[PDB]
Amino acid sequence: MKSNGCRYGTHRVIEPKGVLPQPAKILNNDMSEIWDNEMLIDVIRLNIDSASFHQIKNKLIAQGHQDLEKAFAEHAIELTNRTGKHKNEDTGSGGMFIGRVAAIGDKFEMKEEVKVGDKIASLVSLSLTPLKINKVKKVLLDKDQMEIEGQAILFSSGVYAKLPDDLDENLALSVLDVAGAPAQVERLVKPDDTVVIIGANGKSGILCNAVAKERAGICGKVIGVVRNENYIPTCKATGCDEVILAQATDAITIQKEVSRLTNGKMADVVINVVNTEDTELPSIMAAKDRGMVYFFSMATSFTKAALGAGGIGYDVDMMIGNGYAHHHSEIALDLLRRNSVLMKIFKERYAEHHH
Amino acid sequence: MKSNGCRYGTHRVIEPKGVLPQPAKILNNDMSEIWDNEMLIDVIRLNIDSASFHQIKNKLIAQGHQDLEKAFAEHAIELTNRTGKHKNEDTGSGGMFIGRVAAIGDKFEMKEEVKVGDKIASLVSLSLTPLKINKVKKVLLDKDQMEIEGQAILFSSGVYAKLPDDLDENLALSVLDVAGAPAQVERLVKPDDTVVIIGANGKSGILCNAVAKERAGICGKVIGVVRNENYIPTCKATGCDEVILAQATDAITIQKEVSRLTNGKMADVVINVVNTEDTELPSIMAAKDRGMVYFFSMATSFTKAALGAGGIGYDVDMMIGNGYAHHHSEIALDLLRRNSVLMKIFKERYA
Ligand SMILES: NC(=O)c1ccc[n+]([C@@H]2O[C@H](COP(=O)([O-])OP(=O)(O)OC[C@H]3O[C@@H](n4cnc5c(N)ncnc54)[C@H](OP(=O)(O)O)[C@@H]3O)[C@@H](O)[C@H]2O)c1
Ligand SMILES: [Cl-]
Ligand SMILES: [Cl-]
């Protein structure tokens, strides 16, 4: 194993030469030998980023491909062979994965105690991970996941977690992919706050609904936004006091409905968890003056948010959703254990149980 | 005056019929009749964004033509008369306009007090501004300016300011262009904070250096980051206690040098104002734990920031720098009037 390993894994970077793995366009996908403080994982399953999966899927369809599950599998193997990593070349987003530890480097900065063989989750993005895909066993088009056989590198700077034993690996894969959303909502929402959750039926949305109502309290107000009337009971069961039916791209409808529901006061906090483009301005226009707009979505464009707010004279704080926060995996899992409505939904949507 | 006017400009949106003036491709430029909540202005000069004027030029050179200034005019007439606005259809950008108020709507949400015939600067992009161009008088290459004889609409949600009576027109516009940056930094910097300003030598950077030192005060520490050793005196003159020499795209150098100047404590606040790509992680890696990173540059990539920080286990807050903040014009003009060193550099650079 090579000796002088950058904990950020600059030694894997190929192009351009002076940037770190995530902004890098091409990384080193050679698992023949690892560096001194890397880590090798035999990859079970990829959870591609929802904003990315949705963009690739719509790309393959516009390209006219016949068997999406095959077209997607080819899309993965091709891009990972050419770039070294599954980073979407149009959105910049990645995803995460679960696997079994193959090789711990001599100087790997062991955080959580894991030995060779343990089954862990890479909570850092696929947008920075050197990944080799040998075969794609299965594409799950409606769950953003891919069973594969392959290997990936964890740098000593990366975030990882030994899988909980109380849940199945696929439910754990799903909750951990968005564990940063409820952790951040816990910090943003104060008692008596009005919170608007745009994309409230989604995977991170239903966790944010619940945490938002816990934090805002009996006299706070949680408002979900969805475009399918069938989602309304789930949004209310997971925390929403009110639900607006609107396209997340519809700024004028969302602003009028939030205004009506709040006597013109609008929202202290807006949480954006959709996976499509052009929802920046609708998110901004739901916020009270000097309110907080937290963009968790990887379909967010920095330019549409910045110029969207400025163009209409909105002075609101606009945050870039950080998928990492300290203890987020513990905080997310604790939310599931405390909330059985949420645990039931997650198992039904993302786990593979029997009866 | 047409009633039921939308403060956001939707009533002047033609294509697509579901989004706001900014992302829309087609706008209505009929200045024959304005809405009750609008302001008609007589545009004197069009100040196209550098990257847009450095695209209409580098496209017309290919098809030949003549003069280049004579071809930019033709392009703008066609774009504004068809699209309804001067938003580039490739870079998606547009600068600002100066001119004189011609009509004030009855129910218009007046911000700064102006009258008919006052000379205003628009603080929203041309990318959302209904614009009609009757004739171009001159096209100022390399300065990105366009004298015209046209009119433009500001919506009740627009932002504008009257030109100062006590500062050069070009000096004031140059500072109005970046006024959102020092206004927002004075909210983020607390007393005794370590602040790192990446791009400390630029136009918005020296404004941020000064605000950062004022707010952080005698026992705080302001650290500039520049690529060129000739920039150190300017940074110090405008507030940096220290300057780091490094390429903005070099996270590992910047991180080691900030650890050096701070005994490994790093920055409570990192301010990024370089207009160059791949500077997200270099900005993040200068922050201490649970520190704040402010991205003001349009070169920022949302996913590079979000997935940069999460990818390395950095629990820092990251903010999209708004080009607008309440009273930002007055806040930046007052910063210039209070700070003579800053004022002199500005007049020397942009007047
Ligand atoms: N910051 C990070 O590190 C990080 C990590 C993971 C995820 N993310 C981002 O967070 C977002 C949510 O992730 P997720 O796993 O929760 O995704 P998800 O399960 O697919 O949820 C997306 C939700 O958005 C809704 N939606 C999308 N477009 C809409 C529109 N135009 N109008 C109304 N609703 C719309 C969808 O409802 P429909 O059924 O109506 O489409 C769905 O409920 C994604 O953008 C993802 O990229 C970021
Ligand atoms: Cl612009
Ligand atoms: Cl404090």
TrEMBL record, chain B:
Binding residue positions for NADP(+) 1: D49, S50, A51, K203, S204, R227, Y231, A248, V274, T276, F296, S297, M298, G321
GO molecular function: L-erythro-3,5-diaminohexanoate dehydrogenase activity; mRNA 3'-UTR AU-rich region binding; NADPH binding; quinone reductase (NADPH) activity
Limits of the Alcohol dehydrogenase-like C-terminal domain: 205-298
Domain L-erythro-3,5-diaminohexanoate dehydrogenase N-terminal, chain residue ranges per copy: 11-164
Record bears the keyword Membrane: no
Enzyme class at the top of the EC tree: oxidoreductase
UniProt keyword Zinc present: no
Highest taxon listed in the record's lineage: Bacteria
Residue sites binding NADP(+) 2 per the record: K203, S204, R227, Y231, A248, V274, N275, T276, S297, M298, G310
EC number of the protein: 1.4.1.11
UniProt keyword terms in alphabetical order: NADP, Nucleotide-binding, Oxidoreductase
CC annotations in GO: cytosol
InterPro entries in the cross-refs: ADH-like_C, GroES-like_sf, KDD_N, NAD(P)-bd_dom_sf
Name the UniProt record assigns to this protein: 3,5-diaminohexanoate dehydrogenase
Protein's gene: kdd
